[PDB]
From TrEMBL:
PROSITE patterns: PROKAR_LIPOPROTEIN
Name of the protein described by the UniProt record: ChoE
Alphabetized InterPro entries for the sequence: GDSL (IPR001087), GDSL_Est/Lipase (IPR051058), SGNH_hydro_sf (IPR036514)
Organism: Pseudomonas aeruginosa (strain ATCC 15692 / DSM 22644 / CIP 104116 / JCM 14847 / LMG 12228 / 1C / PRS 101 / PAO1)
Disulfide links within the chain: 244-255
Length: 287
């Protein structure tokens, strides 16, 4: 039986990674190139739509449209759950991880308190895993998962202390079906990581609900994707595994029918899956 709808939302503050970014990695990396920062590259790049790491709006942009809310999207492609980014060269210019996004959001408020009616949307952790795998991190995956969860809990705590009262926390996605993960033969590594994050994060959300009357909503992105992938024709999808827009080892021409594809590139969903995700997220809220 469904629960009561949550209250209407008119402002979203989003924090997170390339599954949310609607233009911040592009703005920041253009700034970094203009200032000659060492190692800087223009992100996301020329096979991506309007600064999104996809071919269309991300899930949180669709959530905002569905709810009739304005969106301040702080998320930055590459962001980890702590201070920094999968792209190490950014750290000398700006701390763009979740913790850095929170720092900057609170610093840009003038000592002014947070809007207690705004929805604080948090969606991060993938790059903690991608960085670990791609650069041979030595931490066991269960400890990495613990670190990601502690970082997320810390961000909620810091935002709540500053005055936030409404949150939407997104689970780990199904990293085990990400094309780069599959091509790297890292599926069971991804399963162990994502299951540890997703088991532990709801327990931390229970603890945080004990003060400030925090509304801490959980979006289980794994449940969402498993349902879509088990019933793809219902949603107009056909190709669940191959990227529409290959980039590795080099860029190839995009597929003709991108709304029938789950993945845009080797890491990111297409606009069609972001739409379905945003609609699923929005279903918990009144208009
Ligand atoms: Cl562009």
């Amino acid at each position: 039986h469904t629960s009561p709808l949550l209250a209407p939302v008119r402002q979203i503050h989003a924090f997170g990674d390339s599954y949310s970014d609607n233009g911040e990695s592009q703005r920041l990396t253009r700034e970094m190139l203009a200032k000659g920062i060492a190692g800087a590259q223009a992100l996301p790049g020329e096979v991506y739509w309007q600064g999104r790491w996809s071919n269309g709006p991300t899930a949180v942009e669709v959530l905002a449209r569905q709810l009739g809310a304005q969106l301040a999207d702080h998320a930055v492609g590459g962001a980890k759950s702590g201070a920094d980014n999968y792209y190490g060269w950014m750290s000398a210019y700006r701390h763009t991880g979740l913790a850095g996004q929170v720092d900057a959001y609170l610093a840009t408020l003038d000592g002014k308190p947070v809007d207690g009616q705004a929805l604080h949307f948090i969606f991060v952790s993938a790059n903690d895993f991608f960085e670990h795998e791609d650069f041979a991190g030595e931490q066991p995956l269960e400890q990495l998962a613990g670190s990601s969860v502690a970082n997320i809990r810390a961000a909620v705590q810091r935002l709540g202390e500053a005055g936030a009262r409404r949150f939407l926390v997104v689970s780990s996605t199904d990293l085990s079906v990400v094309p780069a993960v599959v091509a790297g033969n890292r599926v069971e590594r991804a399963q162990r990581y994502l299951q540890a994050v997703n088991a532990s994060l709801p327990i931390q959300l229970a603890a945080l609900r004990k003060t400030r009357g925090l509304e801490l909503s959980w979006f289980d992105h794994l449940t969402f994707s498993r349902h879509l992938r088990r019933n793809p024709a219902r949603y107009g999808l056909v190709e669940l595994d191959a990227p529409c827009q290959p980039t590795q080892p080099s860029v190839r021409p995009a597929c003709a029918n991108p709304d029938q594809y789950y993945f845009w590139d080797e890491w990111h969903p297409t606009r069609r899956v972001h739409q379905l995700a945003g609609e699923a997220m929005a279903a918990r809220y009144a208009r």
